[PDB]
């Protein structure tokens, strides 16, 4: 609390390329001063939601570790990123625990990701045999097997690739736009306090 030792949490909110939802990114914060006032007062953050800690008293309690999770999803299932619900992405790509604490952030990317040619690099998973435990990645791309028949890696019919591509273009409207999502989580009561905000008077 000087402030000079600001951890680089600006680029986790503003970078070149966000990771896809199936291969989302995690960043670890240590020995820093946590000033969220520059982000709360900033304009274009469309969604600011959390459950465990207060939305405005987040500088008055002091933590030990901070994990910043970043990915990009379609605009509708920003409703679905909250813990409890199911379906696509919540079960097959990213699941939050029922006792989750931390704040989720969502904003639009109208003029930063849409391309007239069509962008297909952002993938999502549609076919998983098991269910995702909370905070778990899945990078394996072996083809789904459906009950029986010898397509167990032959990649033919009655067997579908799990990683499909989004539909991302100026002709699209609200609901199909790319929303950047970053989730700030934290853990407590195992170490001396390292990261938390400055002192005012």
């Amino acid at each position, epitope marked *: 609390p000087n402030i000079t030792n600001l951890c680089p949490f600006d680029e986790v909110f503003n970078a070149t390329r966000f990771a896809s939802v199936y*291969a989302w990114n*995690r*960043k670890r914060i240590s020995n820093c001063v946590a000033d969220y006032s520059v982000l709360y007062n900033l304009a274009p953050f469309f969604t600011f939601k959390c459950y465990g800690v207060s939305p405005t008293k987040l500088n008055d309690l002091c933590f030990t570790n901070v994990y910043a999770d970043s990915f990009v999803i379609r605009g509708d299932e920003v409703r679905q990123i909250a813990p409890g619900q199911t379906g696509n992405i919540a079960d097959y790509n990213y699941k939050l625990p029922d006792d989750f604490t931390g704040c989720v952030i969502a904003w639009n990317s109208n003029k930063l990701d849409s391309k007239v040619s069509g962008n297909y690099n952002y993938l999502y998973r549609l076919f998983r045999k098991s269910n995702l435990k909370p905070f*778990e*990645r899945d990078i394996s*791309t072996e083809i789904y097997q459906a009950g029986n028949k010898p397509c167990n890696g032959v990649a033919g019919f009655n067997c579908y690739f799990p990683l499909r591509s989004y539909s991302f273009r100026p002709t699209y409207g609200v609901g199909h736009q790319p929303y950047r999502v970053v989730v700030l989580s934290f853990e407590l009561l*195992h170490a001396p306090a390292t990261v938390c905000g400055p002192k005012k008077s």
Partner: antibody, heavy 125, light 107 residues
Framework: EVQLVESGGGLVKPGGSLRLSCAAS????????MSWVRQAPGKGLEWVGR??????????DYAAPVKGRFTISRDDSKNTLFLQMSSLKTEDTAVYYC??????????????????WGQGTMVTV | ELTQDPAVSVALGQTVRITCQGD??????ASWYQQKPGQAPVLVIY???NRPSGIPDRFSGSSSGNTASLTITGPQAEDEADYYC???????????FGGGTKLTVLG
């Protein structure tokens, strides 16, 4: 199914250079925190280095006893992970593995739990 | 630097307890790998208390402060192997590894 294949290694005079290649299949290589690890015959496993992912900044680290003299690299087009060894010492006779940190794990931390390993190659200096 | 005993002698059908000593195990929870004779190491336990799928429900993990431990309930004749614990250091974020331990069959 998902596979890592190691290639390279042999007998070489000390002070030379040698390049070890790891080829991966079955998973998205561009978002994997791969690593190199070594083991002397009859001894425990010894870390060599990390390479990390470009989505999050290339932060390729190294182990303390072999810092600097080894070069690590990634190429996503040819699906290759490269380890270059120069200025060799007499203690480098070991088996080498390329190991993916994350395939099916729960993290809570930095994404490293060493899920799937490789068949590993000889090197004798 | 982690610490392990060279070998543990437990008879068949009895719970086997494997230890790992380290100063920085309060954070950076250890992971346990098993090495067969002349084979690549395989994952056994990682994370808080869970294991990868396909591993039989015989290995469990526990941690208390500066101590880490693995528990085997009802060992068979195929568990004669080496066990390695893994943690991280606070500063450099390296995987450091440990000395390992050996487990044999006393039938």
């Amino acid at each position: 199914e998902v596979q890592l294949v190691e290639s390279g290694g042999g007998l070489v005079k000390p002070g030379g250079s040698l390049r070890l290649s790891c080829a991966a299949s079955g998973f998205s290589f561009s978002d994997a925190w791969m690593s190199w690890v070594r083991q002397a015959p009859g001894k425990g496993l010894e870390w060599v280095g990390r390479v990390s992912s470009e989505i999050g900044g290339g932060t390729t680290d190294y182990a303390a006893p072999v810092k600097g003299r080894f070069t690590i690299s990634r190429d996503d087009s040819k699906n290759t992970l490269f380890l270059q060894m120069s200025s060799l010492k007499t203690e480098d006779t070991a088996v080498y593995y390329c190991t993916t940190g994350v395939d099916i794990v729960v993290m809570m931390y930095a994404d490293d739990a060493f899920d799937i390993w490789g068949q590993g190659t000889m090197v004798t200096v | 630097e982690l610490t392990q005993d060279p070998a543990v002698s437990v008879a068949l059908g009895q719970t086997v307890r494997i230890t790992c000593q380290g100063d920085s195990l309060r954070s950076y929870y250890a992971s346990w790998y098993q090495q067969k004779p002349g084979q690549a190491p395989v994952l056994v336990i990682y994370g808080k208390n869970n294991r990868p799928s396909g591993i039989p429900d015989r290995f469990s993990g526990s941690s208390s402060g500066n101590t880490a431990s693995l528990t085997i309930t009802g060992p068979q004749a195929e568990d004669e192997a080496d066990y390695y614990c893994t943690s991280r250091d606070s500063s450099g974020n390296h995987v450091i590894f440990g000395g390992g331990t050996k487990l044999t069959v006393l039938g």
